[PDB]
């Protein structure tokens, strides 16, 4: 019973979380997942500030109210070569990665690794935080509160 959570640098508190190496998070699971990091889904203003500090990904993820890709450098296979906070407009499907916002993170680029999952609750799952540099932090627990996401 294992969940891998690939996480990024934080930019103005905002970071990206990909579960199990594929788009697999529902909006309800995304809110619960950020809560395990003492975090919330970023507002659009929080994500725009993160972008301005250097944050970009090539993956769709939830923020509060939308699914987006923050882009700095145009790339034909990332948000169709757009820059800025690219907003997904038309999709059939509901599962994406998520972004999270930790208000206690540093104000600008924080590319140290994530070494804790501070607010996970008791549970049976081995949850592994996987950093971009490969360093891992694992803990037994659970973060999902909605049955439909388990
Ligand atoms: C580098 C180390 N002090 C550290 C950095 C970030 C985190 N996380 C906490 C959970 O939410 C995002 C950031 C944990 C520890």
From Swiss-Prot:
The organs and tissues expressing this protein are described as: Expressed in the intestinal epithelium.
The identity of this protein, by name, is CD44 antigen
Q: Give compartment(s).
A: Cell membrane; Cell projection, Microvillus; Secreted
Q: What does this protein do?
A: Cell-surface receptor that plays a role in cell-cell interactions, cell adhesion and migration, helping them to sense and respond to changes in the tissue microenvironment. Participates thereby in a wide variety of cellular functions including the activation, recirculation and homing of T-lymphocytes, hematopoiesis, inflammation and response to bacterial infection.
What are the disulphide bonds in this sequence? 9-111, 34-100, 58-78
UniProt's post-translational modification comment states: N-glycosylated.
Q: Which residues are glycosylated?
A: 6, 38, 81, 92, 102
Binding of hyaluronan occurs at 22, 59-60, 86
Q: Which domain of life is it from?
A: Eukaryota
Q: Where is the Link domain?
A: 13-102
Q: What is known of its domains?
A: The lectin-like LINK domain is responsible for hyaluronan binding.
Oligomeric state and interaction partners are given as: Interacts with PKN2. Interacts with TIAM1 and TIAM2. Interacts with HA, as well as other glycosaminoglycans, collagen, laminin, and fibronectin via its N-terminal segment. Interacts with UNC119. Interacts with PDPN (via extracellular domain); this interaction is required for PDPN-mediated directional migration and regulation of lamellipodia extension/stabilization during cell spreading and migration. Interacts with RDX, EZR and MSN (via FERM domain). Interacts with EGFR. Interacts with CD74; this complex is essential for the MIF-induced signaling cascade that results in B cell survival.
């Amino acid at each position: 019973n294992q969940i891998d959570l690939n996480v990024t640098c934080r930019y103005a508190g905002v970071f990206h979380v990909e579960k199990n190496g594929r788009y697999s998070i529902s909006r309800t699971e995304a809110a619960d997942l950020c809560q395990a990091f003492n975090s919330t889904l970023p507002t659009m203003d929080q994500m725009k500030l993160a972008l301005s500090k250097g944050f970009e990904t090539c993956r769709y993820g939830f923020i509060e109210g939308n699914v987006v890709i923050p882009r700095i450098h145009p790339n034909a296979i990332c948000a169709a070569n757009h820059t800025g906070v690219y907003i997904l407009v038309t999709s059939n499907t509901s599962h994406y990665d998520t972004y999270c916002f930790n208000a206690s993170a540093p104000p600008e680029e924080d590319c140290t690794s994530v070494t804790d999952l501070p607010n996970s609750f008791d549970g049976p799952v081995t949850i592994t935080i996987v950093n971009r540099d490969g360093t891992r932090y694992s803990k037994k627990g659970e973060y999902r509160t909605h049955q439909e996401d388990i």
